[PDB]
Structure formats: structure tokens, C-alpha cells
Amino acid sequence: IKTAPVVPPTEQRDMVQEERVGTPVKNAGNANPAADSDNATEGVV
Amino acid sequence: GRRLAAMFYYTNADKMLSLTFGLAGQLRAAADTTVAKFQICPHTIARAQ
């Protein structure tokens, strides 16, 4: 048995951190966001 | 807009001149109709002023 001094549970707080490597684009779920333009065969106002 | 852009690459002044000198005739015949319909003359415009 080894009794060791630890940090009291009430003087620390677990905080969830979300780590990201880059900011997702506007049309993140779209494989081809350029197909709204390539399929505008009548024009756009 | 890429199709319309292509034609302006492939165009000469002669083709554009007739396009717009034809519009000028078309609009002036529609204004001549409106002038005749509503009697637009200096007397009629001055009476409105």
C-alpha cells in the first residue's frame, strides 16, 4: 500500500477541448458546390 | 454567362454595330408610336409644365 498526496477533487475541473486542424468551408457537405452554376443553362440574375 | 462570354471573345465591331443600330431603330419606332398616340409635341409638353 502506498499512500500518496493527490490533488483534492474540488480544486480541479475537467474541461473538454475540441481540437481542429482547419476551418471547414461554407459548403462542407457538398462534393461539388460548383454544379449549381454549371447547371444554370438559362442564366442567373 | 460563359457562353455569352465566349461570343464576345469571338466578335468584331461590324457584328456589334448592326446589333445596336438595329435596336436604335426598333426603339425609335416604338417611341414614334407613343408620340403619335399621346400627341407629344412642344405644345403638349409645355401645357404639362
Question: What is the C-alpha to C-alpha distance for residues B6 and B1, in angstroms, rounded to an integer?
Answer: 9
Under DSSP, the state recorded for A28 is: T
Question: What is the C-alpha to C-alpha distance for residues A23 and A26, in angstroms, rounded to an integer?
Answer: 9
Enter the C-alpha cell of residue B28.
425609335
Distance of CA A40 to the CA centre of its chain: 32
Technique used to solve these coordinates: cryo-EM
Question: What is the C-alpha to C-alpha distance for residues B37 and A34, in angstroms, rounded to an integer?
Answer: 50
* Resolution of the coordinates, Å: 3.2
| Side chain identity, residue A36 | D
Enter the C-alpha cell of residue A33.
458546390
Q: Which candidate, B20, B36, A45, places its Cα nearest to that of B44? A: B36
Enter the C-alpha cell of residue B14.
461590324
Q: Which candidate, B25, B24, B4, places its Cα nearest to that of A42? A: B4
DSSP-derived 3-state class of residue A4? coil
Enter the C-alpha cell of residue A37.
452554376
